[PDB]
């Protein structure tokens, strides 16, 4: 993809799509927000308060301390790995969804690299492509 595009996350024959970038930045921010905020934190005290003649209960506390570490680590690791592809495949869709958004917009006014060669088309003609307000019958016969 393009490296010089800092406007956001089109190219003219750059200006990033302000709509899909706003829908993406707001959405992925909400996913990290829900991952952190859904956690429930309560006051707990850990201190190993059993003497050497209470070692059986000391082992019972171990089995639950060690048991919870096994559960959280497996969930946290797999949640990271599962949501990362769902994020990296979420970006595989936005390109083709923005491609078809413009492809189905101008139907026969150009020829299909994710690029289109158009009738010649100016700045006001391509800023209308980004807006979603592209007038097809204005350049239909050409």
């Amino acid at each position: 993809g393009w490296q010089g595009m800092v406007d956001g996350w089109y190219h003219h024959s750059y200006a990033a799509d302000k709509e899909s970038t706003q829908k993406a930045i707001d959405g992925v921010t909400n996913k990290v927000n829900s991952i952190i905020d859904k956690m429930n934190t309560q006051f707990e005290a850990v201190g190993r308060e059993f003497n050497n003649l209470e070692r059986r209960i000391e082992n019972l506390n171990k089995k639950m301390e060690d048991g919870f570490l096994d559960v959280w680590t497996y969930n946290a690791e797999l949640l990271v790995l599962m949501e990362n592809e769902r994020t990296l495949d979420f970006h595989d869709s936005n390109v083709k969804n923005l491609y078809d958004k413009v492809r189905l917009q101008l139907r026969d006014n150009a020829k299909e690299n994710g690029c289109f060669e158009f009738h010649k088309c100016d700045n006001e003609c391509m800023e209308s492509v980004r807006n979603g307000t592209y007038d097809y019958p204005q350049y239909s016969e050409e």
């Binding site: 993809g1 595009m5 003219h12 707990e44 005290a45 308060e49 790995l81």
Partner: protein, 310 residues
């Protein structure tokens, strides 16, 4: 054309089907940082005992040094000043757990030292100012002159809070040595309460010298309700209470083991390696935490992909 973003990104992420995929922007949800010093807990400073144990600080050990409130207790791994005169403590771990979090704590003299003139004692294993002494907060009742009379003393609680009483019994070295200290060979201690009913008898046994002491001393405790009276009665071998402790109990905590020392700060999660100031959902600092803490996880990197692949 239609394209996507790219920048000067070096951070890498892992995903469920690919490993090490360079990504525009990334964020870690695993907190690995700690300030390395003890702080308060939700706004309350903790009770720290540098070289003294919870038993050594509760009793009047001369090797130890009055804060009325604390969120949790910190004592080092093995404090150097437990019981100067060797012995044990009854329900010691539950008494430590009871005092782990106290809203109000105040030492109170209940029966003065003069009110037991039986005689007093002082062992060389508990030095005060070079000249040996005993525990400050409890009194060792010995016999006096020619005979060992019976002691009947009863303290009634008139405060508005629960108060903690501490008393003990002395276990002599040999049966002939007890006759020296307490004229009667058969001895007892009877502690009466609406709740408590115990009767202690000394166990004469040959033991190894700890701090130059073959004899031991065993301590007990209860909590006296605000309008209940506790009643002692002894024939000797009695370690009587001089002070008490008004207690306001509002929550629970635990005894934290850390050699670190205090810092004037505040935190929500405490760790023997130093407090934590984190809003993250996971951490890999230490298993023994106090306070509202994130979940402990065995991993080094929990980085999500916030940007697209570069």
């Amino acid at each position: 054309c239609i394209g996507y973003h790219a920048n000067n990104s070096t951070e890498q992420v892992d995903t469920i089907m690919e490993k090490n995929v360079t990504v525009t922007h990334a964020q870690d949800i695993l907190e690995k940082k700690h300030n390395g010093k003890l702080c308060d807990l939700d706004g309350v400073k903790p009770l720290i005992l540098r070289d003294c144990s919870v038993a050594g600080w509760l009793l009047g050990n001369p090797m130890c040094d009055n804060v009325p409130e604390w969120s949790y207790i910190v004592e080092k791994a093995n404090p150097v000043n437990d019981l100067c005169y060797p012995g044990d403590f009854n329900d010691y771990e539950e008494l430590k757990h009871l005092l782990s979090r106290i809203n109000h704590f105040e030492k109170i003299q209940i029966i003065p030292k003069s009110s037991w003139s039986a005689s007093l004692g002082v062992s060389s294993a508990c030095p005060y100012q070079g000249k040996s002494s005993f525990f400050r907060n409890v009194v060792w009742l010995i016999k006096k002159n020619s005979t060992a009379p019976t002691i009947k003393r009863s303290y009634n609680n008139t405060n508005q809070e629960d108060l903690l009483v501490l008393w003990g019994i002395h276990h002599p070295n040999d049966a002939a040595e007890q006759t020296k200290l307490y004229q009667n060979p058969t001895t007892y201690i009877s502690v009466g309460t609406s709740t408590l009913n115990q009767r202690l008898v000394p166990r004469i046994a040959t033991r190894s010298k700890v701090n130059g002491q073959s004899g031991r001393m065993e301590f007990f405790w209860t909590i006296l309700k605000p309008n209940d009276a506790i009643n002692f009665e002894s024939n000797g071998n009695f370690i009587a209470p001089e002070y008490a402790y008004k207690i306001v109990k509002k929550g629970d905590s635990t005894i934290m083991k850390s050699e670190l020392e205090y810092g004037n700060c505040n935190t929500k999660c405490q760790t023997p390696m130093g407090a934590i100031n984190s809003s993250m959902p996971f951490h890999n600092i230490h298993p023994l935490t106090i306070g509202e803490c994130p979940k402990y996880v065995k991993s080094n990197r929990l980085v999500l992909a916030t940007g697209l692949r570069n």
